[PDB]
RNA sequence: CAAGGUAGAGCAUGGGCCGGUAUCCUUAAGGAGACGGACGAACUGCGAAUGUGCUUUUCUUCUAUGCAAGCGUAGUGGGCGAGUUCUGGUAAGCAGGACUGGCGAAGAGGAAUGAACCUGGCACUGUGCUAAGGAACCCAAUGUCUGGACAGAGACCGAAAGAGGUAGGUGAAUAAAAUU
């Protein structure tokens, strides 16, 4: 039978990668955080204070409050077939800034131009949506340089 | 019945006609969809272009003339998959078309080796003169030297019961 | 065009069409919930239903999941006409109705006869959503003369499900 | 005595090896793997013949020992001691278990039936897969028909299908005969007993020179 | 285009009277008043009339009462106020 | 856009099997060895497919005969089976988990018969058509073409090991019809 301590089953998780042992780099400490940013959790096994519980490893959430050397992040979780919000305390050594909003922020920068012109000249924005890839395109071909294919390889 | 088709196709990426080459393939199959299927199969095994990066530009049927139904000799090079491995071989047939020759091979191997038609691959089909014939089977029929009588009886009428004194067969 | 092209030793291959046609061949009652949800989003509900779908990368991945239940392919104009004329019908919101001049004029302010409808549906890409979502799913009969093999095998294997390409017209023409 | 071979034929369980976790294991019956003229140079015994598996199963250490004796006795009588080398390729690392139970059962203080059923070590076997080389011979080219007949005798000691086949390779090198001759002439080979090392244009020049003075030619 | 058309339809249908609801009281004076409003609803789209007709069908507990001062507090500068319920005195 | 260490692949720290040329150390034995072959549920240097989460309707597609906070209150808390996989056991219509549909609580047509298999989800009538499975007769609908096969065989049916008969493929010879 299995046990139920705070760091159960973390032999693979919570171990350093090959040729990457030691303390964190300066960039870790010089990064500034703000309320409302999206942030991503990855535990560093060498630091023993401010570690989250291993369920949260590799998950992304939103910063709710900022303190001297730690952050409070909001998560959601299913328990007993219902949704529950959870507020997780994490030290700054175990977090990295998330990339999940990157494309959306670029798109907002384009929208922000159009939405002004749409008051002056038009009435409503064109709004620049994405579209999924359509059907295969048409082609005009010169028809020299033909290559033949054959079952010449007998494959003993 | 079996037919002969020739399929043509090119590579495409996020943009068109990414290579200036065109690829071709002659195939014996029952219809166009079974033809297109074979083209995809060969491209992926001899090169590495998967369907999402290909486009077929043309499919054409190939047909002979032979208004007088003249009889010709053909040799065929083939392989098939068994339980052990892949088996190569050569056999000779007679007929009024390349497709008539090919349908007789497919029937033969199914009869002799218990194989479904999709596990047989044709490598080459060649039309031959009397001096070219290698194996024993067709040579007597090619040199025009055969007559034989009828072994099977044939019914005279569609009726189920007939009078004892009537003629029954042929 | 074909003459001009051949007269200069060149081949022309047109762009793939904007929509596929889908027919529900076999029963979904034991499929998983993920399959059932996908069929709902394509508006397919009973055996021998037929429906039109936009050719697009999202649609092509939905079809990959349901390919063992459905026959699909591309439809030229002659067969599209026989379908709409012999089995077409429409709806406003919860009212089901026959395609008539009054109902077109009401729904689409500039389409007035059933021939203009078919023309826009085939040739104008940017109105497809509005034009398609007006038609109810087509209710077809089983094919005349039956199916030749075990219909649950792939078309390549000699059954009836999968991609029939340019040749779905032959299945639909036996089912109108 | 022993249980019949059908009890332990197929590879049902995960590998299980002698280790800190598993103690009180008996020694395997096979202990000797090479026979004949072990250190004969690669060039001197060109022909290679193998027993090959057409099955996926476990081979007991008792069966491997019986086959060794069978193959060796034949070659020794017919080929002569200095003309051949035999190798048995597979090693019996897997441990089998038994859940031993009393004959006078039904009632005892010992925990009877399927209570606490995990077994104790019983013996050992080798685990084998399709297309694997189980026994290998190298000899003179005159001894083809002899080597064939030697390996035939092993085929009756193991469960399942096995075939005797002749190789393209020179000796216990991995090199096809055609290619070997083409490298031997032109000076590229160094002898290392039963196999060869290939000289390449890779290191420092003074090492290259020192290697080449040692070549087989 | 279509997504907007759809939502604007749902929003409307969420306001309009259901026409398969009826008050449970055996009071014939109350049932008279409902009949008037019902016949007005089927000849109009005006949201105030629809809201009133839906509220006459709700239970005694759903028709919770208000005090005079709270009406004035919620009147937000209007002259006429309407309330499907009973108005009580505020002693303050 | 994140996280993961299974299948495959490998044997660089740790465990661990057999044999080694030159060379080296002693002996005049043995040992070491520039290397090859064989391996681990508690070995890893590399690493899938499928599955999981985050953002965006400023992203396709569907959507009101639809969702639904809150309040009151029922039954249930012996389960069993199929497909894919796993652990204990010589195994078991055996004992115990995981994932997606069932029978329980599911009729109808088909596998001669069968809780769970194939087709396919039931208000009540009438005319047409198909599925699965069939088409000498029992019993509604049957015939055709091409090869094999002779055993009171097969259509329903057991192993390692094998000769005999016959149909074909490939590779060796010899040839004054062919033959091995």
mmCIF file of C-alpha atoms (C1' of nucleotides) in Angstrom, chain C residues 27 29-30, chain F residues 102-111 114-124 131:
data_model
loop_
_atom_site.group_PDB
_atom_site.id
_atom_site.type_symbol
_atom_site.label_atom_id
_atom_site.label_comp_id
_atom_site.label_asym_id
_atom_site.label_seq_id
_atom_site.Cartn_x
_atom_site.Cartn_y
_atom_site.Cartn_z
ATOM 1 C CA UNK C 27 -26.016 3.710 -36.656
ATOM 2 C CA UNK C 29 -26.065 4.414 -30.855
ATOM 3 C CA UNK C 30 -22.966 2.785 -29.267
ATOM 4 C "C1'" G F 102 -23.380 -2.334 -22.640
ATOM 5 C "C1'" C F 103 -26.997 -5.916 -19.457
ATOM 6 C "C1'" G F 104 -28.933 -4.296 -14.729
ATOM 7 C "C1'" A F 105 -33.619 -0.983 -16.091
ATOM 8 C "C1'" A F 106 -33.848 -2.958 -23.400
ATOM 9 C "C1'" G F 107 -38.054 -4.933 -26.907
ATOM 10 C "C1'" A F 108 -37.525 -6.157 -32.304
ATOM 11 C "C1'" G F 109 -34.735 -8.983 -36.925
ATOM 12 C "C1'" G F 110 -30.087 -12.245 -37.313
ATOM 13 C "C1'" A F 111 -25.845 -15.891 -35.264
ATOM 14 C "C1'" G F 114 -28.016 -18.508 -25.345
ATOM 15 C "C1'" A F 115 -28.631 -11.605 -19.988
ATOM 16 C "C1'" A F 116 -24.056 -9.140 -22.257
ATOM 17 C "C1'" C F 117 -22.042 -10.922 -29.727
ATOM 18 C "C1'" C F 118 -23.920 -8.588 -35.309
ATOM 19 C "C1'" U F 119 -27.874 -4.992 -37.359
ATOM 20 C "C1'" G F 120 -30.195 -1.436 -34.641
ATOM 21 C "C1'" G F 121 -33.412 1.847 -29.637
ATOM 22 C "C1'" C F 122 -40.115 0.557 -29.318
ATOM 23 C "C1'" A F 123 -47.233 5.551 -29.084
ATOM 24 C "C1'" C F 124 -51.051 3.646 -32.902
ATOM 25 C "C1'" A F 131 -29.384 -3.639 -42.896
#
